[PDB]
Amino acid sequence: DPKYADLPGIARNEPDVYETSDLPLEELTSTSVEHIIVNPNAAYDKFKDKRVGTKGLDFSDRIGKTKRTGYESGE
């Protein structure tokens, strides 16, 4: 504010801001696929009581037995 009187070249009637007028998905609806609504509650209730037995399993490239099938037991 007092920079007008103490300084010579600080003019008035200056529009400080020169501006312009501040002027103001469809792929899932296909007939090919069957869109499924994912529900974590229903799927969680489905796989709620299904155990997995990991007693002595392997997945690596170890060849000692004939075959190798991990996740043997359940409930």
Partner: protein, 188 residues
């Protein structure tokens, strides 16, 4: 299939050979760096040489335990996920599918051929396998010559260098007169 299985192992070793020329580079690796096992568990629990093969580009590849896990597919097609028999089971069954008076003589005369028997340390494992399957104390004797790769060719030259061969082929005229039935009659 040995080369294809080895290619899959190199994809899991981080080399991604998937082109055609890359596949023949895998064939060169299979012919040079692989070797067969003796007891894959004795060798599976211990780390190995980890051969350093050089690509033609100048790159460097390491193989690790897959250098002996790759030709295991022959003795066990379960690795590739295929219910079939091993090569040892093929030999032993082929003997046992025949008569009984001949089993002992066939065990005493096993002749290999074919390029995929040139794996280093192959026949020794074949002896341990067949010995593990064949009856007690039968003399199993495998003859593996040096010209295994050309045994079928050399033998073709031998049979074709005879007059019985002239009395054995199929006439062009006879083929024109008959067709497929001619070769299916003279197939043996």
């Amino acid at each position: 299939d040995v080369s294809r299985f080895l290619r899959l192992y190199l994809r899991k070793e981080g080399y991604d050979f998937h082109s055609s020329s890359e596949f023949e580079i895998v064939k060169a690796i299979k012919e040079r760096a692989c070797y067969l096992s003796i007891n894959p568990q004795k060798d599976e629990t211990l780390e190995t040489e980890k051969a350093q093969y050089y690509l033609p580009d100048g790159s460097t590849i390491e193989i690790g335990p897959s250098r002996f896990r790759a030709p295991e597919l022959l003795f066990r097609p379960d690795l590739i996920g295929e219910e079939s028999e091993g090569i040892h089971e093929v030999l032993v069954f082929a003997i046992q599918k025949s008569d009984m008076d001949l089993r002992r003589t066939l065990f005493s005369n096993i002749v290999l051929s074919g390029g995929s028997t040139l794996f280093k340390g192959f026949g020794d494992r074949l002896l341990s396998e067949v010995k593990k399957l064949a009856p007690k104390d039968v003399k199993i004797r495998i003859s593996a010559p040096q010209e295994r790769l050309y045994s079928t060719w050399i033998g073709g030259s031998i049979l074709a260098s005879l007059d019985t061969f002239k009395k054995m082929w199929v006439s062009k005229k006879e083929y024109e007169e008959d067709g497929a039935r001619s070769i299916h009659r003279k197939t043996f």
